[PDB]
Amino acid sequence: DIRQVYYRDKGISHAKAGRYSQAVMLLEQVYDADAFDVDVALHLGIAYVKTGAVDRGTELLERSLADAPDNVKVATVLGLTYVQVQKYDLAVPLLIKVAEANPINFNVRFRLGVALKNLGRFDEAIDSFKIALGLRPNEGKVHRAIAFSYEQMGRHEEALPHFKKANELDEGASVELALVPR
């Protein structure tokens, strides 16, 4: 058992550090679809995704979510991976739940917004981006993405201040802060 237990621990340790090739090498040796180990599948799944074995990765992740429906971390990376591969309709349901479940995860909220915007759900997108900007008011990329969503609905007045903020955030440092106490 001991060489197998070493490989599990070392493989997980590798997945956690970004040593994905090695994480695959070790954890393939110990993975078993027949007797589920959710730690092994999550980390091997991530590892497969990051080495370009995306279909095999997502499979492990889908199987892991099915088996532990409550695992926020599995849901998260599955959701985000589908956004990455432009499977937006799959991402959206996953990310909707994660965001409600982890309401300070800004990245999730932003990506949800991006997926919703790609699908042309301009209104829902705008809703998610506002929550996002409540979390991080000075993220230029949300201001830009929400301005584009508004613009597509013809809501130009609403877009404009966001277009301007995004541009000013690019240039850097906002001059008016010079007169705002901390």
Specify the DSSP element, H or E, that contains 32. Answer: none
Cα–Cα distance between 135 and 26 in angstroms, integer?
39
42, 76, 39: which is closest to 84 by C-alpha?
76
Experimental method reported for this structure: X-ray
75, 121, 125, 122: which is closest to 98 by C-alpha?
75
* Helix, strand, coil percentages in the chain from 3-state DSSP, rounded to 5: 75, 0, 25
What length does the chain have? Answer: 182
Q: Token digits for 87? A: 């499977």
Q: How far separated are the first and last CA of the chain, in Å rounded?
A: 58
Q: Report whether 126 contacts 146 (CB < 8 A).
A: yes
Q: Report whether 7 contacts 29 (CB < 8 A).
A: yes
Q: At what resolution in Å was this solved?
A: 2.3
Cα–Cα distance between 45 and 57 in angstroms, integer?
4
Q: Where are the domains of the chain?
A: 5-182
Q: Report whether 102 contacts 108 (CB < 8 A).
A: yes
Cα–Cα distance between 20 and 12 in angstroms, integer?
10
Helices (H), ranges, 28-121? 38-50, 54-67, 72-84, 88-101, 106-118
Cα–Cα distance between 56 and 47 in angstroms, integer?
10
CATH class, domain 5-182, is mainly alpha
121, 71, 81, 116: which is closest to 96 by C-alpha?
116
Cα–Cα distance between 126 and 137 in angstroms, integer?
14
Question: What long-range pairs does 103-107 form, CB within 8 A, spacing at least 24?
Answer: 103/131, 104/135, 105/76, 106/132, 106/135, 106/136, 106/139, 107/80
